Design a protein around this ligand. Structure first.
Ligand SMILES: COc1ccc(NC(=O)N2CCCCN3[C@H](CN(C)C)[C@H](c4ccc(C#Cc5ccccc5)cc4)[C@@H]3C2)cc1
Ligand SMILES: COc1ccc(NC(=O)N2CCCCN3[C@H](CN(C)C)[C@H](c4ccc(C#Cc5ccccc5)cc4)[C@@H]3C2)cc1
Ligand SMILES: [Mg+2]
Lengths: 536, 290, 522, 292
C-alpha cells in the first residue's frame, strides 16, 4: 500500500521524524521492510491487517494513526433488491483519483475472493461497448475478446454492468467529476449495507460538506424492499467486564484509563454505569468479533504490550548435558569402563611421581574450576587397597589395562565420574567432589596423540571451542574458546605433554605417559591419555 | 617423534591444528537441537503431547480453532490437500456434533458473534495436511476438557509438541514446504498476558539471554496476539524470533472447559534457530543434502 | 543379628503338630528369617535371623513364647552393679547350652564388645550373707572362680592375669559352674540405673516363672503409649473397628487397655518389647498381625525409548539423514520395480504391522516431486544418495521416521501414520549384506540376543527369524524378509536392490539395505 | 559381489542365513544403560531428579539426622567406611531447627512421643563418614522443602528419587561387593500411609518386569513400619531381599518443622542385582570392572 510520503504529512499535518514514524507504526499493528521509492517521491508500502476494513485506504489509515498517538478525534436465493446508494455531490482530484482506484483494485479481488457505474452524472440484448472498446454482442458471446490476459476469466462466475467484472457501459461520470452515486451488487443482502456505509464514510473525506450526507433519511424507519425503491449505518454494542481484562492484560486497577485508551484508538466507550462494566460501541469501521477479546486487544495495544509490569524452572542440570559427551565419545569407537571406587596411596602417589598437597593453594578459596591435588585420605579399613579416594582417575584406568593383555590391538576407553579432594574453606563438609572425564588410547605397536587430538577437537566441535588456531585459520578463511599450551609434568613424556586453557583456567591435560610408569603398571605397550574437567 | 619400543633398551612439535580425522559418525543437527529443546522443556516441568500424526482433518486443523474456512489458508496457494481418504467419520456427535462450533461460527456463544455464515460441514470434513501442529495439540485439550468436568478440579497443565508440519506457499527461495515447529501451551484458571510474557522471557532466555520486544498482530486462532523478537545482534540487531498469541474463549468455552479457564500458546520453528546456531545462512543444507 | 536359634524341641514346648513347610511360612510372615539350616547328627535343628530390636526374641524361650502367643493361641563412681537370686530352679544340658547362649547373647549381641555388658551368673547354693562392696579400689585378693585357673597364687603378678579366647582382657581393655543346682543367683554391672534395670530384668523371665527377690543395697516397670485411632486409620490404610485391635494386641502379647473416646486407645508396653518411643511401632505390630498383603490397595512409550536404536545405530560410523517430505508416484511405483498397491485392501492389511504399501496421494501440490507421501524411506535416501556420489568411499546412511498410508477402518480419518527406519550401505565394491547382517543381529542383540543362529544356545522365547522371500526390487536369492512372533508377523526386510532400479535412479555404486518397522516392537 | 553395468548375467550362482558380521562396535556400560532405563521410568511417573553431588557425608546426616543411635553396629567399624581425614564439619541449623532438637531426641522426647535415653554427644555425631546410606543426600532435600513448606505452600505433594554409588566393606563377601549403585524413591504429602506405598510399589515393580506378589515384615531403624518386598520371577520357591521400603518416623520427621498431617514414604534397592537378573549374569565380579 503506497505511502505517498507527502500525502501523509498533509493528511496528518505533522512533522516529527522518519524513524519516529516507522516507530509509531511498528508500535501499531502494521510494519513493513522492503519498501522502495519511485522517482522524486520516497514512498513505502505496508501490510494492513485484514481483521478490520478501516485501514484499507491510506485515508482511513492515516486518520486512525492520527487518532492513535494522542492527536485526533472522531467524525459526525434469488436476491430481491441489491443496494447501490450514495449521495448527490462531491469533489475529486488526481491525488485522490489514484487512491480511489486502489480500493477498486484491492477490495474486489483480495476481500471479495474473485468478487462473489458510480456516476450520478447524466442519469435518471446488447446496445454498446463498456468503455475502451467499440463492440456489441446480443447474448453471451463476449469471452472471445480478451480472456487469457488479466481479465474476468479468472472470476467468471459460480453456477448496470456486472458485480465481478465491472464494465461501466451506460454511465460513468468521469475521472474528473462532481456528482457521484456509487453502486455495487453482492451475493446476499447482509454485507450490502456494510459496503455501502464503508464507501460512504470511506470517501466522505472527499465531499463538499466533509462527512455529511443528504439521503433525506428523516421520514421513515422501515424498509420493506418493495416500495422503498420499486414503484444504513448501524452500530453494535459489546458489554465488557473489567476484572476479566485486568486478569488478561496483566496490568490492572484502573478503569478511567480504559476510557482514555479507547478514545485514543477511535472507539468511544460508554461507561456502563457500574464500576465494572462497559457497553463499548463497535461501529461499522470494525469487523471484529463482538467478544471482548479484541476489545482488550485494543486496550493492550494502546497501553503498549511492552508496558506490562510482571516478570517472576531453572538451570537445574548438568548431568543431562554430560550424556552429550558420552554419546560423542562412544561415536568414536571408545568403550566405557567403570573403575574401582578407591585406589592405593602409592598407586596414585608413589607410582606416579606425585607430591600431592598444597592445601592452602595460594588463592584464598583454591579454585572452583580446576584440576586436582590436595587429595582426600581415608581411615584404615579391612581392605588392602582402600587407602584413598581418586584424585585423577586415569590410574585406575591404567590399572584396568594391566588386567586384559590379550584383547584387540587398539584399546580405546574413557570414563566420567565423581572425584573428591580436601577443601579447607567455606566448602561444606570441608571436602569437595567434582566430576571429571579421562580417556585413553593404546595400540600394541605405535602410539596415539594423533587420534586423541582429533577426538578432543571433535568433542569440542559440538560446543564451538577451537584450538586457538582453527579460529585463526577460519579468520584466515572467512572467540571465547580454548587453547593447548605445552607444559612440564613428570608423569608424562617430555615434548609430549600439554595442559589446556580457556580465562586462563587450566582444566585438562593431554599426554604420553613416561615409560617408567608403564614399567610400574606391568604394561608393555605405549598408551596416551587425557584428563579434563567438565564443571569448567 | 612417536615413541614405541619401550623395552628397557631406549637410546634417545606442531601443536598447530589437528590430527588426521578418520571415520566419524554423527547425528543430524536438527535432531540434536530437538534433543536440547526436549531437555529444557521437561526442565521447566512440561509434558510432551503426542503429535505423532500429520494428516489431521480440516476440522481439528481449522474449525476447532475457530477460523472461517473462507480465508487465505483454505486457498491452495498456501496449503496442501489430500484426496485419498478425503472423508472422516469419528467425530463427537455430541454438542450437536459440535454443531456448537458451527453455531459459534454462524451465531454467538460466550456472548460473542460468529460471521452470519452458513459454515457448512463438508469443508470441515476435507482431509488436509497439517500446516499448524497446534491442530493435533488442540485434540489432546478436549480430552482434558472431559476430565475437568469429570473431576471439577483445576490442574494447570504444561504441554509442548514438535513434529513435522507442512505448507505450500511457492517454490521461491523463501522457506520450504515441510518444516518443524516447537510449540508450548499452559492451561489454568484466571491467568493472563503477564504469565505469557514472563514464560516467553524465561524460555527464550534458555535459548540465549536477550531482552525482548513484541508487536501486536491480527490472527484468528488468538484474538489477542503478538509477534515476539529478541536481541542477539543479527542484522537489525535482533531477530523476529517466534510467534505467539493468547487464548480464544469463544471456541474455548464451547469445548466445555470452564468459564474461568484460560490457556496460552506459542509456536516457532526448529530449523530457523538451527540455521542461526550452527553458523548457517540459508535453509538448504540442514535439510536433505549436507 | 545372628543365627543362634536352636533345636526342634520347640514342637514339644508348643505341644502341637504343624509340619515344616507350614512353619517357615509363619516366620516369613512374622519378621523372622532363616536360610538353609542344619542338623546336629540326630537332632533336626535350625538357625534364625532374630532382630535385635526386641530382646524378647533373643532367647529360644522368649522366641518360642512369642511364636506361641503369636497366632490365635494364648571416689570412683562405680558402675551400679545389681545382683538378684532365685528360690528354686533346675537345669539340664539342653537348658545348660541355652542359658549359656543367653549369657553369650546379652554379651555379644547387646554388648558392643561388652563395655556396659557382662554376665555374672552362679548358683544360690553357696552362701547368703548380706554385704556391701562399693569402695575404693581394693585391699587384698586371693583367688577367683574361672575355669582356666586352679592355683590363684604363687607366680603371676597380682591384679592382672590375662589369658582367654579372644577378648581375654577387660580391666585395661573355677569353683563350680553350678551345673544341676536348684538355687541360683546372678550379678551384673551397668553404667547407671535405667539401663541397669533394662539389661537386668530380662533374666527374670526365665523359668513356673518365679524367682526370689534381689538384695537392694543403696523393680520390673511397665510403661504406656497413648494412640489416636484416625492416626492409625490413615497410616495402615484400613478402617479398623478397634476391637480387632484388642484381638491383635492379645495375639502379639500386648495387653492394651482401651481408653476410648471412640478415637483413642492406650497400650501397655512392657520391657520385653522392641522398645521405641513413638507409638509408631504399635501400628507396626497391628500391621504384622493384620498382614501386609491383605490391604485393599489399588502406559507405553515410543519416541523417547526409540532413540536406543538411534544411539546404537550411530555407533559404528552410520550417519542419520532427514528425508524429503514426499516423493512423486513414479518415484515409488515406476522407478521401483514394484508398482503395486492394495487399494481395496480389505483382506490385506488385516493388521497394520508389516511394512507394506497402500499409499495416499495429494492434490494441489507441487508438480515436480510432490504427488504422494513416502511408504518406504529408502527411495528418498537414494535420492540423497543420487546427489552425492562423489564423497568418500564407504557411504553409510540411515533414517527413522513416521510415514503414512490410507486405512479403510481403524481410524477416525481413515488414515494411519506409523514410524519405522531404513539403513543403507555402499562401498563401490561389495554390498554390505555381511556387514548389514552383523548390524541387524547386533540391534536384535540390543533387545533380544536372538536371531536364529547358534540357536538359543544353552550357555529363548518370543524372538525372530529371517525368512528368505522374493520381492522384485531386490536381487533374487539375495533378499530376505524378517519376522518375529508366535503370530508370524513379518516386519523387516533386508536385501540387495536390483540394479535396474539403479539405472532408473542414476545410481552407480552397489548398495545394500535394510528396512524394518519399529512401532510394532513391544 | 556386484560391480556390473552391462554384464548382468555372467552369474557364478546366486548362492546360509545363520550368522553375524561381528566387527568392531564400541559400546556403553551396562550399568549406565540401566541407569538410563530407570531415569526413563521415573520421569514417566512424574518424579524430580535429586542432586547426589557428594561422596562423603557427616555422620549426623548419615546416622543422627535420622533416629539412628550412635551406639550401634553400623557406627562400629568393619561394617562402614570412615574418612577421618577431614573428620570435622561445621554449620548445621542449630537455631531451633535441627541439632538441639535431635540431641534431645536421643536423650528425651519431642515432636511426638518421648524417649531415646542416651548421651547424645555432638562430636562423634560430627565425624565425617563415607556413605553407607544414600538417603543422606535425600534427607537434605527434605529440610529445604521444610522451609518452603513454611513459607507459603501448604500441601504440594512432592516426589523425589536419587541414585549414586554408596559403599560398605564387611570384609570380602562371597555374594556382594562395595555397593555399586543404589536406587531410592521418596514421596511426601499430607496424611499418607501404607496403602499408597503398596500401590506405588505395585506400579513400579510392575514396570520393571515383575508383579509384586508378597511383602514380609522386617525390622528397620529409620523406618519403623518397614518391609522386604518380593515380586515373582522364576528364581526359586525361596528368595532373597528384592529390595526394601518403609515409611519414616515422626521422631526425625517433625524435627524439621513439618506439619502434623505430614507423612512420607520411602523405598530403596540395589542397581547391580537387577541387572545381573536382566542380562542373565552371575557372580558380578567381571560384569563390573575388569573382564567387561
Ligand atoms: C533464536 O532462534 C530463532 C528462532 C526462530 C527464528 N525465526 C522464526 O521464528 N521464524 C522465521 C521468520 C519468518 C518465517 N516464519 C514462518 C511464518 N511466519 C512468518 C508467520 C514460521 C512460523 C510459523 C508459525 C509460527 C507460530 C505460531 C503460533 C503458535 C501458537 C500460537 C500462536 C502462534 C511460528 C513460526 C517462521 C518463524 C529465528 C531465530
Ligand atoms: C528385579 O530386580 C532386582 C532388584 C533387586 C534385587 N536384589 C536386591 O534388592 N538386593 C540384593 C539381595 C541382598 C543384598 N541387598 C543389600 C543389603 N540388604 C541385605 C539389606 C542391598 C540393599 C541395601 C539397602 C536397601 C534399602 C533400602 C531402603 C531405603 C529406604 C527405606 C527403607 C529401605 C536395598 C538393597 C541388596 C538388595 C534383585 C532383583
Ligand atoms: Mg485480535
Amino acid at each position: 500500500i503506497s505511502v505517498y510520503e507527502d500525502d501523509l504529512f498533509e493528511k496528518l499535518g505533522e512533522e516529527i521524524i522518519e524513524e519516529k514514524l516507522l516507530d509509531v507504526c511498528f508500535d501499531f499493528g502494521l510494519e513493513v521492510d522492503d519498501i522502495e521509492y519511485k522517482n522524486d517521491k520516497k514512498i513505502y508500502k505496508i501490510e494492513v491487517p485484514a481483521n478490520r476494513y478501516d485501514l484499507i485506504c491510506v485515508e482511513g489509515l492515516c486518520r486512525a494513526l492520527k487518532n492513535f498517538m494522542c492527536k485526533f478525534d472522531d467524525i459526525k436465493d434469488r436476491r430481491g433488491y441489491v443496494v447501490c446508494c450514495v449521495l448527490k455531490n462531491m469533489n475529486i482530484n488526481d491525488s485522490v483519483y489514484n487512491n480511489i482506484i486502489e480500493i477498486q483494485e484491492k477490495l474486489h479481488h483480495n476481500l471479495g475472493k474473485k468478487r462473489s457505474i458510480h456516476d450520478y452524472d447524466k442519469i435518471k440484448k446488447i446496445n454498446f461497448i463498456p468503455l475502451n472498446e467499440k463492440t456489441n454482442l446480443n447474448g453471451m458471446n463476449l469471452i472471445d475478446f480478451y480472456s487469457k490476459n488479466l481479465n474476468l476469466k479468472p472470476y467468471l462466475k459460480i453456477i448496470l454492468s456486472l458485480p465481478p467484472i465491472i464494465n461501466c457501459d451506460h454511465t460513468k461520470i468521469s475521472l474528473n467529476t462532481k456528482n457521484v452515486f456509487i453502486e455495487c451488487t453482492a451475493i446476499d443482502r447482509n454485507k450490502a449495507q456494510i459496503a455501502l456505509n464503508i464507501l460512504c464514510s470511506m470517501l466522505s473525506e472527499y465531499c463538499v460538506p466533509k462527512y455529511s450526507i443528504q439521503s433525506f433519511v428523516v421520514i421513515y424507519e422501515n424498509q420493506d424492499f418493495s416500495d422503498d425503491q420499486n414503484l444504513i449505518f448501524e452500530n453494535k454494542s459489546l458489554t465488557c467486564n473489567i476484572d476479566y481484562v485486568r486478569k488478561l492484560s496483566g496490568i490492572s486497577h484502573i478503569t478511567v484509563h480504559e476510557v482514555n485508551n479507547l478514545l485514543k484508538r477511535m472507539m468511544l466507550s460508554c461507561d456502563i454505569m457500574d464500576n465494572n462494566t462497559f457497553k463499548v460501541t463497535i461501529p461499522f469501521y470494525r469487523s471484529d468479533i463482538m467478544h471482548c477479546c479484541d476489545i482488550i486487544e485494543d486496550i493492550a495495544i494502546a497501553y503498549g504490550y511492552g508496558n506490562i509490569k510482571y516478570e517472576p524452572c531453572k538451570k537445574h542440570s548438568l548431568n543431562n548435558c554430560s550424556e552429550l559427551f558420552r554419546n560423542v565419545l562412544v561415536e568414536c569407537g571408545y568403550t566405557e569402563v567403570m573403575t574401582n571406587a578407591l585406589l592405593s596411596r602409592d598407586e596414585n602417589y608413589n607410582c606416579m611421581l606425585r607430591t600431592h598437597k598444597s592445601y592452602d593453594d595460594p588463592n584464598i578459596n583454591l579454585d572452583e574450576y580446576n584440576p586436582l591435588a590436595a587429595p582426600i585420605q581415608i581411615k584404615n579399613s579391612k581392605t588392602s587397597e582402600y587407602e584413598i579416594i581418586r584424585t585423577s582417575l586415569i590410574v585406575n584406568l591404567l590399572k584396568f589395562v594391566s588386567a586384559n593383555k590379550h584383547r584387540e590391538l587398539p584399546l580405546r576407553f574413557f570414563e566420567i565420574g565423581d572425584v573428591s579432594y580436601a577443601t579447607y574453606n567455606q566448602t561444606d563438609t570441608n571436602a569437595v567432589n567434582k566430576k571429571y572425564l579421562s580417556i585413553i588410547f593404546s595400540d600394541k605397536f605405535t602410539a596415539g596423540l594423533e587420534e586423541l587430538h582429533g577426538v578432543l577437537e571433535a568433542i569440542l566441535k559440538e560446543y564451538q571451542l577451537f584450538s586457538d588456531y582453527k579460529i585463526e585459520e577460519k579468520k584466515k578463511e572467512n572467540d571465547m574458546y580454548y587453547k593447548l599450551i605445552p607444559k612440564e609434568d613428570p608423569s608424562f613424556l617430555n615434548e609430549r605433554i600439554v595442559d589446556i586453557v580457556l580465562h586462563n583456567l587450566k582444566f585438562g591435560v593431554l599426554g604420553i605417559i613416561h615409560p617408567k610408569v608403564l614399567e610400574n603398571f606391568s604394561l608393555d605397550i605405549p598408551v596416551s591419555a587425557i584428563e579434563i574437567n567438565v564443571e569448567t | 617423534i612417536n615413541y614405541l619400543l619401550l623395552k628397557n633398551e631406549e637410546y634417545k612439535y606442531n601443536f598447530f591444528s589437528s590430527g588426521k580425522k578418520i571415520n566419524k559418525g554423527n547425528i543430524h543437527l536438527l535432531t540434536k537441537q530437538m534433543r536440547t529443546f526436549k531437555e529444557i522443556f521437561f526442565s521447566l516441568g512440561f509434558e510432551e503431547m503426542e503429535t505423532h500424526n500429520y494428516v489431521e482433518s480440516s476440522f481439528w486443523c481449522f474449525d476447532a480453532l475457530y477460523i472461517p474456512q473462507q480465508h487465505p489458508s483454505r486457498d491452495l496457494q498456501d496449503t496442501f490437500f489430500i484426496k485419498e481418504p478425503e472423508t472422516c467419520i469419528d467425530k463427537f456427535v455430541d454438542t450437536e456434533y459440535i454443531d456448537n462450533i458451527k453455531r459459534v461460527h454462524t451465531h454467538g456463544d460466550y456472548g460473542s458473534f460468529g460471521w452470519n455464515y452458513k459454515w457448512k460441514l463438508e469443508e470441515s470434513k476435507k482431509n488436509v495436511l497439517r500446516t499448524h501442529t497446534t491442530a493435533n495439540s488442540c485434540r489432546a485439550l478436549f480430552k482434558l476438557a472431559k476430565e475437568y468436568k469429570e473431576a471439577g478440579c483445576i490442574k494447570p497443565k504444561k504441554y509442548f509438541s514438535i513434529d513435522r508440519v507442512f505448507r505450500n506457499e511457492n517454490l521461491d527461495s523463501t522457506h520450504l514446504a515441510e518444516f518443524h515447529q516447537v510449540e508450548g501451551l499452559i492451561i489454568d484458571k484466571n491467568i493472563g498476558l503477564s504469565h505469557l510474557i514472563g514464560t516467553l522471557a524465561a524460555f527464550y532466555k534458555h535459548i540465549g539471554i536477550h531482552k525482548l520486544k513484541f508487536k501486536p498482530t491480527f490472527n484468528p486462532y488468538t484474538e489477542p496476539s503478538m509477534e515476539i523478537y529478541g536481541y542477539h545482534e543479527q542484522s537489525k540487531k535482533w531477530l523476529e524470533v517466534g510467534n505467539s498469541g493468547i487464548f480464544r474463549p469463544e471456541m474455548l468455552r464451547s469445548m466445555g472447559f470452564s468459564e474461568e479457564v484460560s490457556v496460552i500458546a506459542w509456536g516457532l520453528s526448529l530449523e530457523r534457530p538451527t540455521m542461526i546456531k550452527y553458523n548457517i545462512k540459508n535453509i538448504r543444507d540442514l535439510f536433505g543434502y549436507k
